[PDB]
Design a protein around this ligand. Structure first.
Ligand code: 1FZ
Ligand code: MN
Ligand code: MN
Length: 423
DNA sequence: ATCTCACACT
DNA sequence: AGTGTGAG
């Protein structure tokens, strides 16, 4: 019943904000945000401290408008190189945190600031080492048990009541107990998070459950600077009022279609349907996935992959800034290829691998789709001038304009991506 | 006028 | 190999 693994998800709190607060002490414990391309309406916000969220500041907001909502908002700007945002500082801090997490167990890098952890073997080790010894609440100073307490008005008071109920109810005698395994997982995650904060300064949240989807959902339940354990038995109560769209992979069109076709709102309602009924509407794979997921069962593995499988660089050119001349297209392809060259040379030196295929993608003014065209070619020698020339070669036939010097329709996006790594 | 990543089809 | 989808 989806209890074969113990999986955690560790996600950093306001990651880019914490990076900037580490760098600049003036930003600590203040409402602040990270910004991009300041000239247009003060820049687009990409990260927001929890103090700023209390005022209603959100990501994707223009900085000028956030300043309208939060006049004391402090701002840190993403580095800009070659006319575009440069995330090196955050990638390096991410690597720092991934390296600390890698000492405890195999991790799967799920984004710049979160990784999944398969803790099964660590749990087995810690249960044989920790033979029948009771687990003290002191080992879980920041852990919430979702669904408890049940059956007095402060947040931490409730947390402690729930943790006491949890440890009181389940015994260490049977070491195949899923709930005990989850609890040992949570102890390990407390240790991991303490190590991360000690060695980097960054605080983070985590979810501990039996699979990746529940771990991700749990992590968000008690942000920030806390962790949440979602037990198998907690799933029905958790899911009974949990919107479908909150579940990983159901936040888009498929989730909307599940809501529309089945006439439900919450994840638990999926349980009433048989597997073959769900496979009828959503296909064998989606039907079986929904059928298992709504009961708290998921098998997607924590992949042993800390490093990205591709290295890409994209820039949009919206509205009047769209690229309309051949000279413009070649210059921006060069800029993208130069950043790509830097990141690729560093990647080969750090990670002992080389990309062998270059993917070029563009968008044309008018196309509603994010990408209009994607093509490929050989990738050799990590040379920005060569890569940019090859990209121009592979897209040049897309220029409708009869005049060679002009490009039409204007380009609203450029994308270079290195793929197909070899040792 | 909000950029990277993954993977499932075909 | 190219498109659509989901996410963070
Ligand atoms: C959704 C999104 C996130 N990010 C960055 C901002 C975050 O710093 C980083 C981590 O994603 P997140 O964990 O979902 N958000 P957060 O890390 O800022 O904060 P928290 O984990 O919710 O506390 O991803 C983007 O750069 N473009 C985006 O569209
Ligand atoms: Mn985060
Ligand atoms: Mn994240």
């Amino acid at each position: 019943t989806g209890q074969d693994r113990v999986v955690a998800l560790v996600d950093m709190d306001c990651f880019f904000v914490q990076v900037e607060q580490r760098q600049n002490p003036h930003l600590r414990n203040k409402p602040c945000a990270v910004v991009q391309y300041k000239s247009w309406k003060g820049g687009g916000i990409i990260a927001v401290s929890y103090e700023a969220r209390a005022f209603g500041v959100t990501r994707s907001m223009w900085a000028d408008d956030a300043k309208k909502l939060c006049p004391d908002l402090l701002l840190a700007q993403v580095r800009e190189s070659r006319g575009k945002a440069n995330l090196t500082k955050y990638r390096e801090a991410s690597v720092e945190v991934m390296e600390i997490m890698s000492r405890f167990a195999v991790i799967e890098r799920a984004s710049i600031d979160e990784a999944y952890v398969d803790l099964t073997s660590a749990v087995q080790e810690r249960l044989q080492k920790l033979q029948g010894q009771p687990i003290s609440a002191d080992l879980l100073p920041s852990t919430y048990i979702e669904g408890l307490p049940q059956g007095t008005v402060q947040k931490e008071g409730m947390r402690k009541q729930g943790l006491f109920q949890w440890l009181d109810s389940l015994q260490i005698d049977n070491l195949t107990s899923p709930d005990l395994q989850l609890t040992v997982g949570a102890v390990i995650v407390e240790e991991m998070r303490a190590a991360i904060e000690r060695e980097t300064g960054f605080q983070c949240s985590a979810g501990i459950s039996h699979n990746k989807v529940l771990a991700k959902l749990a992590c968000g339940l008690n942000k920030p600077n806390r962790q949440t354990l979602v037990s198998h038995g907690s799933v029905p109560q958790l899911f009974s009022q949990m919107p479908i769209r909150k579940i990983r992979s159901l936040g888009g069109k498929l989730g909307a279609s599940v809501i529309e076709i089945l006439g439900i709102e919450y994840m638990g309602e999926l349980t009433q349907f048989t597997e073959s009924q769900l496979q009828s509407h959503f296909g064998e794979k989606n039907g079986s996935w929904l059928y298992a997921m709504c009961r708290g069962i998921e098998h997607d593995p924590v992949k042993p992959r800390q490093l990205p499988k591709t290295i890409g660089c994209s820039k949009n050119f919206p509205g009047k800034t769209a690229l309309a001349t051949r000279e413009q297209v070649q210059w921006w392809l060069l800029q993208l290829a130069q950043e790509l060259e830097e990141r690729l040379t560093k990647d080969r030196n750090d990670n002992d691998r080389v990309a062998t295929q270059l993917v070029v993608s563009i968008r044309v003014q008018g196309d509603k789709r994010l990408s209009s065209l994607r093509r490929c070619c050989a990738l050799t020698r990590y040379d920005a001038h060569k890569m940019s020339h090859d990209a121009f070669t592979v897209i040049k036939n897309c220029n409708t304009s009869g005049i060679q010097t002009e490009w039409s329709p204007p380009l609203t996006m450029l994308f270079l991506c290195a793929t197909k790594f070899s040792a």
